[PDB]
Amino acid sequence: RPVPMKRHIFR
Amino acid sequence: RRRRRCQVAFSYLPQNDDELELKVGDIIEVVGEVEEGWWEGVLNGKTGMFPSNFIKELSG
């Protein structure tokens, strides 16, 4: 399975 | 305004309230990139965030 990258940014 | 579509390669359940659920084979209307690895798109009427590395590459 792929690994999601970390998130910081949102609409 | 022509469409920009892509296909989900791997399923994904949301980890934040702004994220889409992805199911293999789903076709997303792409809005744009938000952060490295993260695009916004429209899927089954809902707009939300999704991991771009879960999308299928076009290779014939």
Short mmCIF file of N, CA, C and O in Angstrom, two decimals:
data_model
loop_
_atom_site.label_atom_id
_atom_site.label_comp_id
_atom_site.label_asym_id
_atom_site.label_seq_id
_atom_site.Cartn_x
_atom_site.Cartn_y
_atom_site.Cartn_z
N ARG A 1 0.83 -1.20 0.00
CA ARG A 1 0.00 0.00 0.00
C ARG A 1 0.87 1.26 0.00
O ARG A 1 1.93 1.28 0.63
N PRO A 2 0.43 2.31 -0.68
CA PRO A 2 1.17 3.58 -0.63
C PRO A 2 0.97 4.27 0.72
O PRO A 2 0.05 3.96 1.48
N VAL A 3 1.86 5.20 1.01
CA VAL A 3 1.86 5.94 2.28
C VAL A 3 1.50 7.39 1.99
O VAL A 3 2.20 8.05 1.20
N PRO A 4 0.45 7.94 2.60
CA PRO A 4 0.14 9.36 2.40
C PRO A 4 1.22 10.25 2.99
O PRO A 4 1.81 9.94 4.03
N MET A 5 1.47 11.36 2.31
CA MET A 5 2.39 12.35 2.84
C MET A 5 1.74 13.15 3.97
O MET A 5 0.51 13.23 4.08
N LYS A 6 2.57 13.72 4.83
CA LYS A 6 2.06 14.56 5.90
C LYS A 6 1.33 15.78 5.32
O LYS A 6 1.66 16.26 4.23
N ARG A 7 0.34 16.26 6.06
CA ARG A 7 -0.49 17.40 5.66
C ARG A 7 -0.37 18.53 6.67
O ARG A 7 -0.33 18.29 7.88
N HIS A 8 -0.39 19.76 6.16
CA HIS A 8 -0.53 20.98 6.96
C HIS A 8 -1.52 21.98 6.38
O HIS A 8 -2.00 22.85 7.12
N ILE A 9 -1.81 21.92 5.09
CA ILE A 9 -2.48 22.98 4.37
C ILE A 9 -3.90 22.55 4.05
O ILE A 9 -4.15 21.40 3.66
N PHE A 10 -4.84 23.47 4.22
CA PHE A 10 -6.25 23.22 3.99
C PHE A 10 -6.88 24.45 3.36
O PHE A 10 -6.34 25.56 3.43
N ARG A 11 -8.03 24.26 2.72
CA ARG A 11 -8.76 25.37 2.13
C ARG A 11 -9.34 26.25 3.21
O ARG A 11 -9.34 27.48 3.08
N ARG B 1 -15.08 25.23 -20.52
CA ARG B 1 -14.49 24.53 -19.39
C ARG B 1 -14.52 23.02 -19.58
O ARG B 1 -15.55 22.37 -19.36
N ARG B 2 -13.40 22.45 -20.01
CA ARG B 2 -13.29 21.02 -20.22
C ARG B 2 -12.85 20.33 -18.94
O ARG B 2 -12.27 20.94 -18.03
N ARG B 3 -13.12 19.03 -18.87
CA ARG B 3 -12.90 18.28 -17.64
C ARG B 3 -11.43 17.95 -17.44
O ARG B 3 -10.65 17.87 -18.39
N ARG B 4 -11.05 17.77 -16.18
CA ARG B 4 -9.76 17.20 -15.83
C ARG B 4 -10.04 16.04 -14.88
O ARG B 4 -10.34 16.25 -13.70
N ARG B 5 -9.96 14.83 -15.40
CA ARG B 5 -10.30 13.63 -14.65
C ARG B 5 -9.06 12.80 -14.36
O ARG B 5 -8.10 12.80 -15.13
N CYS B 6 -9.08 12.07 -13.24
CA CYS B 6 -8.05 11.07 -12.95
C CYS B 6 -8.70 9.88 -12.26
O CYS B 6 -9.84 9.97 -11.78
N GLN B 7 -7.98 8.77 -12.20
CA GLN B 7 -8.51 7.51 -11.68
C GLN B 7 -7.78 7.10 -10.41
O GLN B 7 -6.55 7.14 -10.36
N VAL B 8 -8.55 6.67 -9.41
CA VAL B 8 -7.99 6.19 -8.15
C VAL B 8 -7.38 4.81 -8.34
O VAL B 8 -8.04 3.89 -8.86
N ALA B 9 -6.13 4.64 -7.89
CA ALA B 9 -5.44 3.36 -7.94
C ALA B 9 -5.55 2.56 -6.64
O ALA B 9 -5.51 1.33 -6.68
N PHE B 10 -5.67 3.23 -5.49
CA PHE B 10 -5.71 2.59 -4.18
C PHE B 10 -6.78 3.25 -3.34
O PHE B 10 -6.96 4.47 -3.40
N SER B 11 -7.49 2.44 -2.54
CA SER B 11 -8.53 3.01 -1.68
C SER B 11 -7.92 3.77 -0.51
O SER B 11 -6.76 3.57 -0.11
N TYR B 12 -8.72 4.67 0.05
CA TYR B 12 -8.25 5.53 1.13
C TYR B 12 -9.46 6.02 1.90
O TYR B 12 -10.43 6.52 1.32
N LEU B 13 -9.40 5.89 3.23
CA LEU B 13 -10.44 6.43 4.09
C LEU B 13 -9.95 7.71 4.75
O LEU B 13 -8.77 7.82 5.11
N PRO B 14 -10.83 8.70 4.91
CA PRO B 14 -10.39 10.02 5.36
C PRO B 14 -9.79 10.01 6.76
O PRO B 14 -10.26 9.29 7.65
N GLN B 15 -8.75 10.82 6.95
CA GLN B 15 -8.15 11.06 8.26
C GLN B 15 -8.41 12.46 8.79
O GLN B 15 -8.04 12.76 9.93
N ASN B 16 -9.00 13.33 7.98
CA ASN B 16 -9.42 14.66 8.37
C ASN B 16 -10.77 14.95 7.72
O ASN B 16 -11.10 14.36 6.68
N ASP B 17 -11.53 15.86 8.31
CA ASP B 17 -12.91 16.06 7.87
C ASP B 17 -13.02 16.72 6.51
O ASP B 17 -14.12 16.79 5.97
N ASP B 18 -11.91 17.18 5.93
CA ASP B 18 -11.92 17.75 4.59
C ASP B 18 -11.50 16.75 3.52
O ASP B 18 -11.38 17.15 2.35
N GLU B 19 -11.26 15.49 3.86
CA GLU B 19 -10.73 14.51 2.92
C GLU B 19 -11.84 13.66 2.32
O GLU B 19 -12.87 13.39 2.96
N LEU B 20 -11.61 13.24 1.08
CA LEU B 20 -12.48 12.30 0.39
C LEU B 20 -12.18 10.87 0.79
O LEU B 20 -11.05 10.53 1.16
N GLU B 21 -13.20 10.02 0.74
CA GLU B 21 -12.96 8.58 0.63
C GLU B 21 -12.66 8.24 -0.82
O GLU B 21 -13.37 8.67 -1.73
N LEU B 22 -11.61 7.47 -1.03
CA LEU B 22 -11.27 6.96 -2.35
C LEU B 22 -11.56 5.47 -2.43
O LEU B 22 -11.23 4.72 -1.50
N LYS B 23 -12.15 5.05 -3.54
CA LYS B 23 -12.33 3.63 -3.85
C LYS B 23 -11.64 3.36 -5.18
O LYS B 23 -11.68 4.20 -6.08
N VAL B 24 -10.99 2.19 -5.30
CA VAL B 24 -10.27 1.85 -6.53
C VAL B 24 -11.20 2.01 -7.72
O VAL B 24 -12.34 1.55 -7.71
N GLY B 25 -10.70 2.68 -8.76
CA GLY B 25 -11.49 2.91 -9.95
C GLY B 25 -12.31 4.19 -9.95
O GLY B 25 -12.83 4.56 -11.00
N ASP B 26 -12.45 4.86 -8.80
CA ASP B 26 -13.17 6.12 -8.76
C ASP B 26 -12.52 7.13 -9.71
O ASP B 26 -11.30 7.18 -9.85
N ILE B 27 -13.35 7.95 -10.34
CA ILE B 27 -12.89 9.00 -11.24
C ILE B 27 -13.14 10.34 -10.56
O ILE B 27 -14.28 10.68 -10.25
N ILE B 28 -12.06 11.09 -10.33
CA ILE B 28 -12.09 12.37 -9.63
C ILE B 28 -11.94 13.50 -10.64
O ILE B 28 -11.08 13.44 -11.53
N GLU B 29 -12.75 14.54 -10.49
CA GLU B 29 -12.55 15.79 -11.21
C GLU B 29 -11.55 16.62 -10.43
O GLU B 29 -11.83 17.05 -9.30
N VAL B 30 -10.37 16.85 -11.00
CA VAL B 30 -9.28 17.50 -10.28
C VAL B 30 -9.47 19.01 -10.26
O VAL B 30 -9.68 19.64 -11.31
N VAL B 31 -9.35 19.61 -9.07
CA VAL B 31 -9.36 21.06 -8.89
C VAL B 31 -7.93 21.57 -8.97
O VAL B 31 -7.63 22.46 -9.78
N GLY B 32 -7.04 21.05 -8.13
CA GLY B 32 -5.66 21.50 -8.16
C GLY B 32 -4.87 20.93 -7.01
O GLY B 32 -5.39 20.21 -6.16
N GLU B 33 -3.59 21.28 -6.99
CA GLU B 33 -2.68 20.84 -5.96
C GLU B 33 -2.73 21.82 -4.79
O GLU B 33 -2.82 23.04 -4.99
N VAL B 34 -2.69 21.29 -3.58
CA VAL B 34 -2.74 22.10 -2.37
C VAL B 34 -1.42 22.04 -1.60
O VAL B 34 -1.00 23.05 -1.02
N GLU B 35 -0.77 20.89 -1.59
CA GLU B 35 0.46 20.65 -0.86
C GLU B 35 1.11 19.45 -1.52
O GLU B 35 0.44 18.70 -2.23
N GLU B 36 2.41 19.28 -1.32
CA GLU B 36 3.07 18.10 -1.88
C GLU B 36 2.34 16.85 -1.42
O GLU B 36 2.15 16.62 -0.23
N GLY B 37 1.89 16.04 -2.39
CA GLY B 37 1.16 14.82 -2.09
C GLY B 37 -0.34 14.95 -1.90
O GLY B 37 -0.99 13.95 -1.61
N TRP B 38 -0.91 16.15 -2.07
CA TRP B 38 -2.30 16.40 -1.70
C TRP B 38 -2.96 17.29 -2.74
O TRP B 38 -2.52 18.42 -2.97
N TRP B 39 -4.00 16.77 -3.38
CA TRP B 39 -4.78 17.50 -4.36
C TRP B 39 -6.20 17.67 -3.83
O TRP B 39 -6.65 16.94 -2.95
N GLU B 40 -6.90 18.65 -4.38
CA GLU B 40 -8.32 18.82 -4.16
C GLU B 40 -9.07 18.38 -5.41
O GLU B 40 -8.60 18.61 -6.53
N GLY B 41 -10.21 17.74 -5.21
CA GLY B 41 -11.00 17.26 -6.33
C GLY B 41 -12.44 17.06 -5.93
O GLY B 41 -12.82 17.23 -4.77
N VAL B 42 -13.26 16.70 -6.92
CA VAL B 42 -14.68 16.47 -6.73
C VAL B 42 -14.98 15.02 -7.09
O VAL B 42 -14.62 14.56 -8.18
N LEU B 43 -15.63 14.31 -6.18
CA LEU B 43 -15.92 12.89 -6.35
C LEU B 43 -17.33 12.65 -5.84
O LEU B 43 -17.60 12.88 -4.66
N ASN B 44 -18.22 12.22 -6.73
CA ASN B 44 -19.61 11.93 -6.38
C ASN B 44 -20.27 13.13 -5.72
O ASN B 44 -21.02 13.00 -4.74
N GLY B 45 -19.99 14.32 -6.25
CA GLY B 45 -20.59 15.55 -5.80
C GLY B 45 -19.87 16.25 -4.66
O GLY B 45 -20.13 17.43 -4.43
N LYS B 46 -18.98 15.56 -3.95
CA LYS B 46 -18.30 16.12 -2.79
C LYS B 46 -16.93 16.64 -3.20
O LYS B 46 -16.18 15.97 -3.91
N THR B 47 -16.60 17.85 -2.75
CA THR B 47 -15.28 18.43 -2.93
C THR B 47 -14.43 18.14 -1.71
O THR B 47 -14.88 18.33 -0.57
N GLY B 48 -13.20 17.68 -1.92
CA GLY B 48 -12.35 17.42 -0.78
C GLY B 48 -10.94 17.07 -1.20
O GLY B 48 -10.60 17.00 -2.39
N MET B 49 -10.12 16.81 -0.18
CA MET B 49 -8.69 16.56 -0.31
C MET B 49 -8.40 15.07 -0.45
O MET B 49 -9.08 14.23 0.13
N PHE B 50 -7.36 14.75 -1.22
CA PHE B 50 -7.01 13.35 -1.39
C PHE B 50 -5.53 13.21 -1.68
O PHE B 50 -4.91 14.13 -2.23
N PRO B 51 -4.93 12.07 -1.33
CA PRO B 51 -3.49 11.87 -1.55
C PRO B 51 -3.21 11.58 -3.01
O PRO B 51 -3.72 10.60 -3.58
N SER B 52 -2.39 12.42 -3.63
CA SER B 52 -2.15 12.30 -5.07
C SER B 52 -1.35 11.06 -5.44
O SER B 52 -1.42 10.61 -6.60
N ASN B 53 -0.62 10.47 -4.50
CA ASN B 53 0.10 9.24 -4.79
C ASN B 53 -0.79 8.01 -4.74
O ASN B 53 -0.28 6.89 -4.89
N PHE B 54 -2.09 8.19 -4.55
CA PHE B 54 -3.06 7.11 -4.67
C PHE B 54 -3.74 7.09 -6.04
O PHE B 54 -4.67 6.31 -6.25
N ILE B 55 -3.28 7.94 -6.97
CA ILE B 55 -3.88 8.09 -8.30
C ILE B 55 -3.09 7.26 -9.31
O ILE B 55 -1.86 7.16 -9.23
N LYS B 56 -3.81 6.66 -10.25
CA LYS B 56 -3.18 5.82 -11.27
C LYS B 56 -2.47 6.66 -12.33
O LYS B 56 -3.02 7.62 -12.87
N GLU B 57 -1.23 6.28 -12.64
CA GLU B 57 -0.53 6.87 -13.77
C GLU B 57 -1.07 6.29 -15.08
O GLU B 57 -1.46 5.13 -15.17
N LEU B 58 -1.10 7.14 -16.12
CA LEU B 58 -1.49 6.70 -17.45
C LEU B 58 -0.27 6.12 -18.15
O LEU B 58 0.66 6.85 -18.51
N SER B 59 -0.29 4.81 -18.38
CA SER B 59 0.79 4.09 -19.04
C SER B 59 0.24 3.13 -20.09
O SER B 59 0.55 1.94 -20.12
N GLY B 60 -0.62 3.65 -20.96
CA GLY B 60 -1.13 2.89 -22.08
C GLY B 60 -2.27 1.96 -21.71
O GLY B 60 -2.78 2.01 -20.59
#
